[PDB]
């Protein structure tokens, strides 16, 4: 029917958290049914659909939208990729499921950019993000545009800062601050966890990464020793948005519902519930 929507999502705590069905064969508590096509091994396309239970910040948004926009859904986790890249002229991830009409919309920590907006429509952003900076509490830097980053050699001792390679942040820095990117290569980290350790252990002065992620890690940092820059100094500001098919008849109602949630304070409630920590 026209009112039952296929919706794709991506496991990414705390925005989307996946659990096993409890014992019954149903999802309880604050979770919703979501299926996953689990591969047989890493060298095959064969697999099996498995019933899971999904919960989180983005799931509660989906529950709010389903109730307000008045639609039902079948939620499933993407398997080919993560959020979405254009690999060999083909979109994978959550973007691909929408572009190739396998999903009506995609819910998750999906950053709005110009590249993706050409193949999918994005809703209004429900969470602000961008390129931010995290330092040990006390260190003085503005945003990415600080001269201490653009020209690290102009200062003594020069700042030691990096990111996680092959991500959106490095791709932006490579295009906008070429020398900063060249300087960062010898300071890049395996992941977020190894970056925060480098900041605490004095091996790294600044970590440059997604704004929403850095803010979430800062609010639950043990000892509250890591802090992010103010929102006014975030570079290339954007947001997490819900992707839809181009010309979708649902985008108008989704936008009004999302803007209502921001105005209602329901969005703040979800941020306090899922994203705010103890710092």
């Amino acid at each position: 029917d026209d009112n039952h929507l296929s919706i794709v999502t991506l496991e990414e705590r705390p925005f989307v958290i996946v659990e096993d069905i409890d014992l019954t064969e149903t999802c309880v508590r604050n979770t919703v049914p979501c299926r996953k096509f689990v591969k047989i091994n890493n060298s095959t396309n064969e697999g099996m659909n498995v019933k899971k239970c999904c919960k989180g910040f983005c799931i509660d948004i989906l529950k709010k939208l389903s109730r307000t926009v008045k639609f039902t859904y079948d939620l499933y986790l993407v398997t080919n990729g993560k959020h979405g890249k254009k690999v060999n002229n083909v979109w994978n991830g959550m973007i691909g499921e929408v572009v190739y009409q396998r999903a009506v919309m995609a819910v998750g920590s999906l950053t709005i950019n110009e590249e993706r907006s050409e193949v999918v429509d994005f809703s209004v952003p429900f969470v602000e993000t961008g390129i931010s900076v995290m330092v040990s509490r006390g260190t003085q830097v503005t945003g990415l545009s600080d001269k201490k980053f653009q020209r690290p050699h102009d200062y003594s001792p020069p700042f030691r800062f990096g990111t996680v390679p092959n991500g959106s942040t490095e791709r932006n820095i490579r295009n906008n601050y070429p020398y900063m990117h060249q300087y960062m290569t010898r300071f890049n980290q395996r992941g977020v966890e190894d970056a925060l350790v480098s900041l605490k252990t004095g091996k790294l002065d600044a970590f440059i990464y997604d704004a929403a992620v850095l803010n979430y890690m800062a609010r639950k940092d043990e000892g509250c020793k890591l802090v992010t820059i103010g929102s006014g100094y975030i570079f290339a500001t954007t947001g997490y948005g819900i992707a839809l098919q181009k010309g979708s008849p649902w985008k108008r109602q989704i936008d009004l519902a999302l803007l209502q949630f921001v105005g209602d304070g329901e969005m703040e409630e979800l941020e306090t519930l899922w994203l705010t920590g103890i710092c």
């Binding site: 709005i112 950019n113 110009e114 907006s117 050409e118 961008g130 545009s145 932006n172 295009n175 906008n176 006014g232 570079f235 290339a236 500001t237 954007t238």
Partner: peptide, 23 residues
């Protein structure tokens, strides 16, 4: 208009305006 605004965020054009006028 929206594609242009997104690109202007991504290529640092909005950073120039924000630094010149806002900050």
């Amino acid at each position: 208009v929206s594609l242009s605004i997104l690109k202007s965020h991504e290529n640092g054009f909005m950073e120039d305006l924000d630094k010149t006028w806002v900050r």
